[PDB]
Design a protein around this ligand. Sequence first.
Ligand SMILES: O=C(O)c1cn(C2CC2)c2cc(N3CCNCC3)c(F)cc2c1=O
Ligand SMILES: O=C(O)c1cn(C2CC2)c2cc(N3CCNCC3)c(F)cc2c1=O
Ligand SMILES: [Mg+2]
Ligand SMILES: [Mg+2]
Ligand SMILES: [Mg+2]
Ligand SMILES: [Mg+2]
Lengths: 487, 487, 245, 247
Amino acid sequence: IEPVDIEQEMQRSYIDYAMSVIVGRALPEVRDGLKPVHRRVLYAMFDSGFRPDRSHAKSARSVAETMGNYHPHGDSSIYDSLVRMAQPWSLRYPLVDGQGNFGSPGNDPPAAMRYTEARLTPLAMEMLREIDEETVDFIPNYDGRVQEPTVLPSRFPNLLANGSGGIAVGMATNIPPHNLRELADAVFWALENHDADEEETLAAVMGRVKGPDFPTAGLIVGSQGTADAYKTGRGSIRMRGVVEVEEDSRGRTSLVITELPYQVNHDNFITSIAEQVRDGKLAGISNIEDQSSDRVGLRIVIEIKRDAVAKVVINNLYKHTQLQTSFGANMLAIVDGVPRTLRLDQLIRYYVDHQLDVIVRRTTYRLRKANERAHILRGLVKALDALDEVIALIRASETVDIARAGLIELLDIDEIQAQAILDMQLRRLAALERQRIIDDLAKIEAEIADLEDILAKPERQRGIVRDELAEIVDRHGDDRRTRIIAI
Amino acid sequence: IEPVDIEQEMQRSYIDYAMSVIVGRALPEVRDGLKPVHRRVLYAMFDSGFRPDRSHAKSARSVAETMGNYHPHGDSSIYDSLVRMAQPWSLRYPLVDGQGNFGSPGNDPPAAMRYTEARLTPLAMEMLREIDEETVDFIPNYDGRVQEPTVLPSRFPNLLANGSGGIAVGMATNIPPHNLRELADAVFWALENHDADEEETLAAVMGRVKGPDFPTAGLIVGSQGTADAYKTGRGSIRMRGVVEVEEDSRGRTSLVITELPYQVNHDNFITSIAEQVRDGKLAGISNIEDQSSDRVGLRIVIEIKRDAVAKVVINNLYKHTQLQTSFGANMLAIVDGVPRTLRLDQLIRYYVDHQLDVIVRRTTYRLRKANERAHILRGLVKALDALDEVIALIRASETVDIARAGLIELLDIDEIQAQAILDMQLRRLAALERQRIIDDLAKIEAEIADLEDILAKPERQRGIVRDELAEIVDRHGDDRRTRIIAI
Amino acid sequence: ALVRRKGLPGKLADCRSTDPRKSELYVVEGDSAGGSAKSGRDSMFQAILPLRGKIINVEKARIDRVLKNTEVQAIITALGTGIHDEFDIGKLRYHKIVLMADADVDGQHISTLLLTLLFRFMRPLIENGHVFLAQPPLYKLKWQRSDPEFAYSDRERDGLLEAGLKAGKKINKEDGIQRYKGLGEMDAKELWETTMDPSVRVLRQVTLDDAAAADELFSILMGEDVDARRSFITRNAKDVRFLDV
Amino acid sequence: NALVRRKSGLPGKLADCRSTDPRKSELYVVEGDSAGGSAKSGRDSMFQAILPLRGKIINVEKARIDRVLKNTEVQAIITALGTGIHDEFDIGKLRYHKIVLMADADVDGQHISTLLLTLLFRFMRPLIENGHVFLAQPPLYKLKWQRSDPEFAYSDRERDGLLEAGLKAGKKINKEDGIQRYKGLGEMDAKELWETTMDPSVRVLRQVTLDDAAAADELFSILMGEDVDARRSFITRNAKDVRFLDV
DNA sequence: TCATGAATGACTATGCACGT
DNA sequence: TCATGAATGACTATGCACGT
Ligand SMILES: O=C(O)c1cn(C2CC2)c2cc(N3CCNCC3)c(F)cc2c1=O
Ligand SMILES: O=C(O)c1cn(C2CC2)c2cc(N3CCNCC3)c(F)cc2c1=O
Ligand SMILES: [Mg+2]
Ligand SMILES: [Mg+2]
Ligand SMILES: [Mg+2]
Ligand SMILES: [Mg+2]
C-alpha cells in the first residue's frame, strides 16, 4: 500500500477538476462560441446526416450517436443540451430544428426523448460548412476509435450571436446574444480595416453593435452597462418587458404585459406578483389573469384599482419583479485553451482570425486535392497519346503487376498515375470521352492557378470571408427584437 | 359532432387492443420464437453492424436504432428487453452479448443504458443468417420509411431452445427452454421421417427432447408434467434446486443450496426463508448465511439445530419456499397470425417447415443472381473473343451510346451486357484476368447446375437443413444443465 | 358558477371561465401531450387533466384500492361530482368531458378504462351526453407552397393527396407526409388546429342506449372472468370491421 | 470489540459485510449505483461492505451544518461509519478499520474524492490521522489477448508497456475488440471490479496521510471554502505546475 | 435564497393471465 | 398478494459563480 498525503491529493484532484471544467465543460471556445457538449451534438447530427435536406430524425438517435462516439456522459443531460439548442426563447439563432414538444418559456417541461424529433438548422449547417476540407483540427475521441473536431468552422459569429452562460470553477461566463446583421457589419469593418489598432477597432465595432439582441425581445434601458461590457468585459445591462395600458368599457384600466426580459420564467413571474399581492406588496392591482395562448403569445393582464395610477403600478412592478431585471454581462471565453475576459474588439478580431484560418486551410486543402487530380489526369493524357501501345502492353502482360511495371517504363509515369490507367474504364476510350480528360486537365490547371492566387493574396482571403458571410446574413439574418431606449 | 354508442366503442376498441397485444406484442411467432420487440432489436443491431466481428457498441445506440426505425415506443422498456436477452440466467441461449453490469438473478438491477455496451451473439447471428437473400418476407415499418422483417430465418429452433413467457389478453404463454442438442435430434428425425404422421412424430420427438433445460440448472422431479405439456400443450413441471448437506467440525449440520429453480429470485428466496423463521414456521433452522460470490456462484448456507433432521428441514423448505416450485407450461404461440396451443410435434414440424421455406427461398434468390451474373459474363466472353474489334468501335463513337449500340450489333448483345462491357476496366485485359473471366463463367454455370438441382429435389433441401443445423449445434451446442430424476 | 384554481389536483390545468356550462375538461393521455395541450388550449373555456400510465380497472380492482389511485382521485376531484350513490351532477365542473388518447391500441385501451370508470362510478355523465372522444390526426400533409392539411385516416390521406396533386400542388418526398404515432409527438399548434379548436375538432359524443346490455359488455370485457372474455374475443374479433357496415 | 451487521438501523443502500470484527472489516464507498451494484456482487461479502453514493456529495465546507446533516448521502456515510462527528466522535465505535473511497478515474471521480475527503477531514478527522482512509485506483484499460489471460492497466504508460511486452512475447490481440478502455466504474462488471480494486491480493490502494494539519486546514478552506477569489488565484497559480508535484 | 446549465439515475403505478 | 414481461416519464439533490 502506497502512502499519499492529503494535501497532495486534494490539490492535484481539485485542480484537475477545475481545469477540465473551465476549458472542457462550462465555458465556450471563442472561435465558435460552443461548449464541448454543443460541438459534439452538432457534429454527431451532422455526421449522421440529420440535416435540413432530410426529415427530422428521432432525437434519441442524435443523443445516442453523441454518447457512443464523442461525449462519454449521460443520455439524460445530453438530451437537455440538445433541447436547449432548439428553443427559440433560449437561442437567438437556434442550431437545432426541433419537431415536437420542446417545452415553453414557463415551467412546462420539454417532452421526453422518445417523443421528439430533431435535425440541424440551416444556420447550424454554416457552423459545419466545409468541415470535411481540413478547415479545422481534428483529434481522436475518448477511446481513439474515431476523430472529432476540436472546433467548428463557424461561418457566422456564433459566440456573439447566440451568447453563452456557464458556471465553471473559480469563474463563470455570461455573454448575451446579439443581432447577426449588426455583428456582420462589425466583421466587415474588421476585415476592411485589418490594420486598425485596438483603440480604433473598439470604437468602430461598438458603433455597429448597438447592444445585445435577446430572443425574448423586450427593452434595454440605458447605454452605460452595454458600453461597460464592451470596454471592460463586464457590465450590468438593464432589461425591461413591454407594458401596454388598456382601458375598459366601464372605465377600468388594466396593464397588458406582452414581453419579458431575457431568461425570465413566465410562470415564476406570474407566481411572484401573485405572492406579492396577497401578502401585501403591490397594492393598486385588482386582478391577475394570464390570457396567453399559442396564437397571441405572452399576454398577462393586470387589472388595477380605480384609485391607482398606471405608471405607479408599472414602476412598482419594475422594482419588485423581473419585469425589470439586469443582465450581468461577463465576457469570458476560452482563447487558445486559456480562459480570458475579452473586449468586444477582441471577440470580433479573434473570430475574424478564425475565419481567415478556415479559408486559408480550405484553399490549401483544395489546392492539394487539385494537384492530385491534375497529376493523375496528366498520366491519362500520356496514355491517350500512345493509346495504341498502352492497350497492347496490358494485353501482352501475363499479370496486372507486369502490366503496371511496363506502363511506368514506357510513358515515364508514376505508379499512382500508372494505376489510374489500369483503373480506366473502356468508356473513357470513346472519342468525346478522350476529349473530356483533356478539357478536365485544362479545367483544373485553371482552378489550381486560382487557388494559388488566393493563398498569395491576403486581400482575396479577406474578400472571401466578407462575400461568404454576406450571403449567410442576407439569407439567415433577421430584424432586431430587443428595442434600445435611453434613460 | 357525431354520436357513438358506448357498446360500439367499447367492443371495437378493446378487441383492437386485445388482438394487437395477442398477435403483435405479448406472444411469440412460432417460426422464430420471437416477439416483435425482440425481432426488431436484433435486426436493428444487425443492420447497424453490431456483430461479433466488431467491438461492443454502446447499448444506447441499439435502442435508438430500434426505436427510430422499427419499434415506435419508449427507450426505457426497449432497453429492458435488450438487457434480458443478454442475461445468462434468463435466456438458455443468450442472443445479446452484453458488456457491463446487466444485473443479477437477485434484486441487483441492471446498469443504466449509458453504462452498458452490447452486440449480437454468434447464435443470434444464426437467427439472422442470410436474411439479406430474400429468405423472409419484409414489410414497411411504422412510417413506411424503411423495411423490416416479418420473421427471422432462425437457423436454430429458438422458440423451444430459449422458450417464451408472455401475458396477453384473454390468454398467456409460458414455454420453457430446452437443450439445443436434444432439439436438433428431434429436428433431424422430423427431416428423415418427413412423411410420418402426428402419432408417430410425437412419440419420436418426445423420446429425444427429454424435457426442459433451464439456464439456472436445478432439477426436474417426475415425468408426468413434462409429458402433459408435450401432448396437451399444458402441463405442470416440478422443479427443484440442489441441496448438499455438510457436517461442520463442531457437530453441526448445514444445508448448502447451490442451485435454484427457473425464475426464482435469489434475494427473495433468502428473504422468504428468513421471514418464515423469525416467527415459527421453519423450525430446525438455526442460522441463514449467504456465502455467495462472483467466484463460487450461488451458495446459501442453512445451519440447522442439532435436534433437527436434515431431510425434514429440506422437505419443509420444499413445501414452504420456492426451493421446490412448479413451472406452469402453456405452449402458446402465434401460428400464421393466429394464437395456438401446440403439441411438441407441431412445434418441431412448424419450425422444420420454416427452415425448408428459408432454404428454398435462399436457393431461388441465389439462382436468380447466378443467372444475372452468368448473363453478364456471357457478354464479357464474347468481348474477349473479338477483343480487337471491341476496342475499335468504342473509339469512333461520339458518345458512349453510339459505342454501346455498336456492341449489340457486333456481338449480338443485350443492353445489360453491353453496359457491363463498357464499365469494364483495363485492369481485366491482362492475360490472367482474361482467363479469370472465362473460369468465372464456368464456375457460375457449375453453381447454377447445383442450385437447379436443389430446387428439383426435396431430398437435398432437407439435407441442407440437417447439415447446416448440424454445424450450428456442433459449434454452439452445450451440455444439459437441468438434471431429470424420477419420483 | 364554480371557482377555478389560480383544493384541486396538482396536475389539473384549470380553465378561467367559472361557468361549467361553458367549460370543457380535456382528459389527456401522457404528460407530454397534456403539456402541449395546456399551451395550445383556449385557457378561457378549456382545462387539461393529464393522466399518466394505464388507468386502474375499476371492474377488477376492489373499491378501496381504486380510491387510493392517484389518477382516479384526480378525475373524481376535478369533475366535482361524487361517485355511485353520492353522485351529484349539480356539482359537475365541466359540461364537456373530452377523452383524448393516442390513435394507437394503448390509447384505445386507456379509453375503455376511462369509459369503465365513468360508466361504473359516474354513469349520469354518459347518459346526459357530457362525455366525448376527441379524434386525433394521423397524418400531416406539408405542401411546398400551400398550407398544411391534416388527415384523420388512411383514406383521407389518399384523398387529400390526390386532390392536391390534381390541383397542381407539390410535396417533398423527404419531409412529405408527417405521420403521427401519438399525441406526444404533436406540438401546441398542431393539437389546437386538430383536436381543441372548436371550429375544426372532431369530437364523438358517447351515447348510452341499452343500459342492461352495456352493463353486461363492461363486465365481460373488463371483469375478472377471463374465459368469458377469451370466448367473446374469439367470437367477435372476427367481425369488428363490420360493426358499422 | 464487535458490532452487529444488518441482516433482514443502518442505511438502506448499505450492503454490509458478515464479519463482526471492525479490524478485519472494510467499507467501500462507491461512486454510482451501477458501480456499487457490481461491487456488491464481486466483493468478498465476509469482510467487504459497499455503500453506493449517488451524485456529487454536498460540500460541508460551504453548506451550513444543519443542511449537511439533512443530506441523505452524508447521513448514510456517518451512520455506516458508526463514529460520531466533531466533538462526539469516537473511534471505538468505528465499524470499519478500512474506508476505501472508490470513484471513477475521470475528472468527476476526482471531484467526489475531494468532497468526501473534505467531509472526513472536517467531521471525522481522526479517521485520516489513524490511516483508516484509502483510495482505490481503478483500471483504465483491459488488454484482451487472443489466447492469453487478459491484463489490466492503470495508466497509459502501463498499457503501452504490457502491450509491447506481450507482442514481444509472441502474444496477439484483435485490433477490433482489442484494448477495452474504462471510462468509469459503472462500465465494469462484478468480476473486473474484484480483480482490480477489491481483491486484497491485487488491489492498488493509497492510504491517505495527514502531515501538516494546519497546512491542510488552509488548503481545504481555500479549495472548498466560500471565498471564490482565493480559490481562483490558487488555481491560476498552481495549476501550471500540477504535472511537476512528484518529479 | 433562487435562477442559471453542464456534470454526478433510482423509484414510483397501472393492464394483462396464471399459479402459488 | 407476488412473480413474470412488454406496454403506458416526472421527480428527486448536490457542485459551481453571481446578482438580486
Ligand atoms: O417507460 C417506462 O418504463 C415507464 C413509463 N411511465 C409512463 C406512463 C408512461 C411510467 C409511469 C409510472 N407512474 C405511473 C403513474 N403513477 C406514478 C408512476 C411509473 F411508476 C413507471 C413508468 C415507467 O417505467
Ligand atoms: O442524468 C441525469 O440527468 C441525472 C443523474 N443522477 C445521478 C447521480 C447520477 C441524478 C441523481 C439525483 N439524486 C441525487 C441523490 N439524491 C436523490 C436524487 C437526481 F435528483 C437527479 C439526477 C439526474 O437528473
Ligand atoms: Mg437531469
Ligand atoms: Mg419502466
Ligand atoms: Mg401511444
Ligand atoms: Mg464518471
